[PDB]
């Protein structure tokens, strides 16, 4: 039977699903690790024990325990990102969409969801792999991993909460794909991992971490890189936040054992209710429990790894969205509102700058303000709004990714860069937010191909192009069709630094994506803060 | 006799001179102080002793002892600024151009020449007051003052070389105009002092210094202000340079008396030959002996005087030239040449930046470089050239003058600002130099009205407009004709900050003259250098 598969962990029973008036197979909720509950909380994941009988993989699994956004009850715009299944600590499962008839040895794509390392689910509607698996004929896999304190509590030096266990979760899911995808028709020597936001940062971390390098062939990073100021902390800051977490729940703090044990007796929602109280500064775009430079998963500091070429050399395709920051300003900066043009005063502008660059002294805050202010029109509400929007995106997503791509390209075997600047016609968020963080995802998964979702004809065409780029790159290491007649996505080189825009207009090639600012955020400011 | 005048110092005999096919009276070389020679060198000036008989004032006086530019032998471009008379320490004289028939009580204009406080003469062809006195019917006076070590050697604490004696020279010339101009037809209660470069800086210093405030009514400042980074030094740096001067001439350095005496036995050219060896840094646009904040001429620091409103309140008219820096780059920065387009490499660019901001640490040099570089075209030879040109002008002339005008306007009784951006059609300097430092002078003195000099018709028209503005402002405190139909030069206010361009095109009003950079040079950089 096409829906029955015999893996090294036991038999699995999938289900048939309709897609664009056709059908493909889907194996939902396959376990890849033992449930990380009770004594296992905060602990490294263990391989799932083989099982007899047939595993029913016809329905989505639960979502990991996480913080749930309630800033806009009912609003589809924000609820489409919330967990759509019962949350549970028993969350380590993966999903597979296989073409029909079943392939013999085709290209594999493993998706890693984003969510600031504090949220995310593989089961969201925007992550339905059926459209992509169907249209491009690839085996699509979406894994899951623990988030928040459950996957990133770090008390370096102990084995009960070593840290980075959330990344080990992803690595284990990849280990399973490596050992079993052949039974689903996938080629294990041709797996491409791709993700967005924290997922894009995760993908870059597997490229850097020695223990993950051999588990995949290529990588796609969307709006996120391993060296983002929010994606990781020192073992010291990790320890500091873990303890403060314990202090908010009145736990015995005399020893790691004392603290960990107390945290293991707590109900999931009890740790989530106080999770945001441990941040060191009043800030925007910063999260409590994230990966930590421990000397294990990451041998040394990330910057020295990037300079010494200490990372997997292969091809990578990555890019960013035009307005990466508007989302975090809406939820956390004074002056912004979902229902207004949000014109910002000088007052709120400088107030927002303090929230965006939390680790900066006054001299630094002044440097940023000078770099993003037009003194010929300093009280222009729309210029201060977009200025604040650029700052948040540049510092948190764009400038950090450009530093990675430039460091990587010096040792890699091929880089392809894009700038996504098309605002979907059906977006429910206000206009001032522009091309929002995470909204290029829907084009990657092909949602525009389904009429009932209401996209335009040009938006459907754009989705097929992107899907064909991502898929063609996954298979060959180049997003372009060998002998095509279409426009060529030029390769990004240390010298030219070419990149393309991704929208519904005739492709255009550009150079040096936001260099002026990237030099400010990657060369000048760091130096300023270190001297002063 | 129209050419005979009886002043409080004695009788004076002038000469008749032709101008634009007419005639006016000229009294050249009238003494206003005793010759500052021998024991008087470096000493404060003394009033000239009255004389019997008639003083022959029909020929120009000598020029003060000074450094002479020989970088381009024969080249009119640079020699038109060199002394055109025998140099001598006996140099304190003034020149007066009086309309014919002699006025009864008309507006007076006293010109103070520029030259970095190390050069200058009242007798240059470009400073011939006859055209202006004739065309606008005003009494025109040009004074002289000691420059270089002769007028600025400063050994605070002693009375033999107190410092600022060069400024006291100007003040004395003004004292004479105040006590005697009435006998030449001038109104002593309506004297306007105006100058360019160091002369513009001098004018601003008389506005600040308590002892000079009552000697004039209004002031015009061209391309120079009292707070320019090159116009003054601390008593300590003054003392340091005076001593180093003595060390270059092998003088006994055990005491001020020892040093001063040794410097007084030296021939003029001996001090001039080593004058440039005392600068503290390898630099561009910096001079050895300049005014010093001594607590006498200047009560306190200049910045505190400007903030407390401690200065003469009146009307002022001032502005700058488009390309104030090209002249100092030509003579002192690697890469620039009089006979080439001078395209600058990245190498020379950063090299020039080090020479332009001599007192800056590496962090500061990097701030400037980032502020003036276009990272999308960083190896563009023409962009690095103009970038270096803007830096020198902004830091040395434009940003400092904007700080003054903004501080002054808060307490003054009327400010008028201009931006001169017309390059004369007969300039002998290369094109890359643009609207050069000091070339607005020729329009102020009316040289374009004389056919044989070869200006265009629009350039002659521009000269009459400027002459009428300067003269109409000198008489009324407003450059505009009461009920004219022409375009109005709007008043500069703290709020709007309006200013006009000065060229051969239909007047246009603008706002916030180079604010972006002025905020960098007046607010950010100072702060950066002080924190680091």
UniProtKB/Swiss-Prot annotation, chains A, B:
Glycans are attached at residues 56, 413, 454, 530. Isoform H form is a homodimer; the asymmetric form is a disulfide-bonded oligomer composed of a collagenic subunit (Q) and a variable number of T catalytic subunits. Changing residue 422 to Q: Almost no loss of activity. GO terms for biological process: acetylcholine catabolic process in synaptic cleft; choline metabolic process. An interchain disulfide bond is present in what becomes position 593 of the T isoform. The gene is ache. The keyword Transit peptide does not apply. This is Acetylcholinesterase. Inhibited by substrate concentrations above 0.5 mM. Terminates signal transduction at the neuromuscular junction by rapid hydrolysis of the acetylcholine released into the synaptic cleft. May be involved in cell-cell interactions. InterPro entries: AB_hydrolase_fold, AChE-related_enzymes, Acylcholinesterase_fish/snake, CarbesteraseB, Carboxylesterase_B_AS, Carboxylesterase_B_CS, Cholinesterase. Its EC number is 3.1.1.7. GO terms for molecular function: acetylcholinesterase activity. SUPFAM superfamilies: alpha/beta-Hydrolases.
């Amino acid at each position: 039977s096409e829906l029955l598969v015999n893996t090294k962990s036991g038999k699995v029973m999938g289900t048939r699903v309709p897609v664009l008036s056709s059908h493909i197979s889907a194996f939902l909720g396959i376990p890849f690790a033992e449930p990380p509950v009770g004594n296992m909380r905060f602990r490294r994941p263990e391989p799932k024990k083989p099982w007899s009988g047939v595993w029913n993989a016809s329905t989505y699994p639960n979502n990991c325990q996480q913080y749930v956004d309630e800033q806009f009850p009912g609003f589809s715009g924000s609820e489409m990102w919330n967990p759509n299944r019962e949350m549970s600590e028993d969350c380590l499962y993966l999903n597979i969409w296989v073409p029909s008839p079943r392939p013999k040895s085709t290209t594999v794509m493993v998706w890693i969801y984003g969510g600031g390392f504090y949220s995310g689910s593989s089961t969201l509607d925007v992550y339905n792999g059926k459209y992509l698996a169907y249209t491009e004929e690839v085996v699509l896999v979406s894994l899951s991993y623990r988030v928040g304190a459950f996957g990133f509590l770090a008390l370096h030096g102990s084995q009960e909460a070593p840290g980075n266990v959330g990344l080990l979760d992803q690595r284990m899911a990849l280990q399973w794909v490596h050992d079993n995808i052949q039974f689903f028709g996938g080629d294990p020597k041709t797996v491409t991992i791709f993700g967005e936001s924290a997922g894009g940062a995760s993908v870059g971390m597997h490229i850097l971490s020695p223990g993950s390098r051999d588990l995949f062939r290529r990588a796609i990073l969307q709006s996120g890189s391993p060296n983002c100021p929010w994606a990781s902390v020192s073992v010291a800051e990790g320890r500091r936040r873990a303890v403060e977490l314990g202090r908010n729940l009145n736990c015995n703090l005399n020893s790691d054992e004392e603290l960990i044990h107390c945290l293991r007796e707590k109900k999931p929602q009890e740790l989530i209710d106080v999770e945001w109280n441990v941040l060191p500064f009043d800030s925007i775009f910063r999260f409590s429990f994230v990966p930590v430079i421990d000397g294990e998963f990451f041998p040394t500091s990330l910057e020295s790894m990037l300079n010494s070429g200490n990372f997997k050399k292969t091809q990578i395709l990555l890019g960013v969205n035009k307005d990466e920051g508007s989302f975090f300003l809406l939820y956390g900066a004074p002056g912004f509102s979902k229902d207004s043009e949000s014109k910002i005063s000088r007052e709120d502008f400088m107030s927002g700058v303090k929230l965006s660059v939390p680790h900066a002294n006054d001299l630094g805050l002044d440097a940023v303000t000078l770099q993003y202010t037009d003194w010929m029109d300093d009280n222009n509400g729309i210029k201060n709004r977009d200025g604040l929007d650029d700052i948040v995106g540049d510092h948190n997503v764009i400038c950090p990714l450009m530093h990675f791509v430039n460091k990587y390209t010096k040792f890699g075997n091929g880089t392809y860069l894009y700038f996504f600047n098309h605002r979907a016609s059906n977006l429910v968020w206000p206009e001032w937010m522009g091309v929002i963080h995470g909204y290029e995802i829907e084009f990657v998964f092909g949602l525009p191909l389904v009429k009932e979702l209401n996209y335009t004809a040009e938006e459907e065409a754009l989705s097929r192009r992107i899907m064909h780029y991502w898929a063609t790159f996954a298979k060959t290491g180049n997003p372009n069709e060998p002998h095509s007649q279409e426009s060529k996505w030029p390769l990004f080189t240390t010298k030219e630094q070419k990149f393309i825009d991704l929208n519904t207009e005739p492709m255009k090639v550009h150079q040096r994506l936001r260099v002026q600012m990237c030099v400010f955020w990657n060369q000048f400011l760091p130096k300023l803060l270190n001297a002063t």
